[PDB]
Design a protein around this ligand. Structure first.
Ligand code: AKG
Ligand code: CL
Ligand code: CL
Ligand code: FE
Lengths: 428, 18
């Protein structure tokens, strides 16, 4: 990596001295040394990059977003200087984009990634990085165009393949997605050994009836992406007790279960009142988890945040649930009514995280036709009774009754998570 | 988009720095 232009070679002794302070962990002294070099040599790209790298380390030491914001600007400054070597220009803007993403400055990262592609139009990896930037802002359409361009010049780029396949699968182009995800994982290219691509390749195969799916789940388990073939969540705290079905006593949340079952009819009646008088509060399921049929949800809590308008529609239910922070405070779960109609089949799937358990309270359950499989075990609901499963295990639902089926879904923190972990885990 | 029942998004958590 050639990082020194003509002038920087002449001041290499000063540049090396400041960098040695950084490598020895004397970050404060290293920042001031590179700051002095920037003051004395304001056009040196290596001095500016050293300042930015030191600010980068200082932000890690202080855990300061604001210090990192200064580093992000100094990386940009490197690129504006005259006579910047190409390798240093790429490193500086790539680190700038990376740190922008870390801070959640996704639009800024996109501008930086777009500048990189304009400056280095033949660098396929930079286009791949741009595609990631679009995916992180939710722009699947522009991401798809980026990976199409990559695959036109380098058809066997495994990173582009798995990301192109991921987008196809997200767009419900299930059969089309399989060879891209498969060949991309099989390429072994850097960035392809990723649990997300194992997860969606196996799921796409299950949706088309390809029996090879579980061979890929087994390989993902053996490579450390999944806790097991059955439990395939990717946002995990390791060591939590892993079992598909739970009893109320096993969870320890017996007071919550008792209150749900003692008061189930008020929960039912408010749900029915919304069905009859405010049905627009039930929103269609929006994660492509249905093969067919009608499934809608009316959500009272999500990410540990109460929906005030939603609670106007079920005020007694919300009042009841407020006494149980084990569910209202579960920032990796929801509290919601779930209605499912006949002719509905929910694809086998897994939730995102092993940090929650999922309670189902039966509200209106037809006598026949409704059932839920979790792992290798199938059960059914009962009116006024709570079922508890770990939805990080693969589960699947059928509705073949002659009338609607209404349940109440109550997520709780995994009972073995300490209060310290329940406070510091990012919301999902 | 959020990962509520499934794992369909590229990332399920928000980027917010330290
Ligand atoms: O039966 C339902 O309403 C939803 C089933 C499901 O996939 C879940 O509760 O995670
Ligand atoms: Cl200068
Ligand atoms: Cl409905
Ligand atoms: Fe589910």
């Amino acid at each position: 990596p050639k990082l020194l232009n003509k002038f920087d070679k002449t001041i290499k002794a000063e540049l090396d001295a400041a960098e040695k302070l950084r490598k020895r962990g004397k970050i404060e002294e290293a920042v001031n040394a590179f700051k002095e070099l920037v003051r004395k040599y304001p056009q040196s790209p290596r001095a500016r990059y050293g300042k930015a790298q030191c600010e980068d380390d200082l932000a890690e030491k202080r855990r300061s977003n604001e210090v990192l914001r200064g580093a992000i600007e100094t990386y940009q400054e490197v690129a504006s200087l005259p006579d910047v070597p190409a390798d240093l220009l790429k490193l500086s803007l790539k680190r700038r984009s990376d740190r922008q993403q870390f801070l959640g400055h996704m639009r800024g990262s996109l501008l930086t990634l777009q500048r990189l592609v304009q400056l280095f139009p033949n660098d396929t990896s930079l286009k791949n990085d741009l595609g990631v930037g679009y995916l992180l802002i939710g722009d699947n359409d522009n991401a798809k165009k980026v990976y199409e361009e990559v695959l036109s010049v380098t058809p066997n780029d495994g990173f582009a393949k798995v990301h192109y396949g991921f987008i196809l699968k997200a767009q419900n182009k299930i059969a089309e997605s399989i060879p891209y995800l498969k060949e991309g994982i099989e390429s072994g290219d850097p960035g392809t050994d990723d649990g997300r691509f194992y997860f969606h390749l196996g799921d796409a195969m299950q949706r088309v009836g390809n029996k090879e799916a579980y061979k890929w789940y087994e390989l993902g388990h053996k490579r450390g992406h999944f806790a097991s073939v059955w439990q395939r969540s990717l946002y995990n705290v390791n060591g939590l007790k892993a079992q598909p079905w739970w009893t109320p006593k096993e969870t320890g949340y017996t007071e919550l279960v008792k209150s749900l079952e003692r008061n189930w009819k008020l929960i039912r009646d408010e749900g029915l009142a919304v069905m009859d008088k405010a049905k627009g509060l039930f929103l269609p399921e929006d994660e492509n988890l249905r093969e067919k049929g009608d499934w809608s949800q009316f959500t009272l809590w999500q990410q540990g945040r109460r929906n005030e308008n939603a609670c106007k529609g079920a005020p007694k239910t919300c009042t009841l649930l407020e006494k149980f922070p084990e569910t209202t405070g579960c920032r990796r779960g929801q509290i919601k009514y779930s209605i499912m109609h006949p002719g509905t089949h929910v694809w086998p799937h897994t939730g995102p995280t092993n940090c929650r358990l999922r309670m189902h309270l039966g509200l209106v359950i037809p006598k026949e036709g409704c059932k839920i499989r979790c792992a290798n075990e199938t059960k059914t609901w009962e009116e006024g009774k709570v079922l508890i499963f770990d939805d990080s295990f693969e589960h699947e639902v059928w509705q073949d009754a002659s009338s609607f089926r209404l349940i109440f879904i109550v997520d709780v923190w995994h009972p073995e998570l300490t209060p310290q972990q329940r406070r510091s885990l990012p919301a999902i | 988009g959020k990962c509520k029942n499934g794992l369909g998004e590229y990332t399920c958590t928000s980027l917010e720095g330290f």
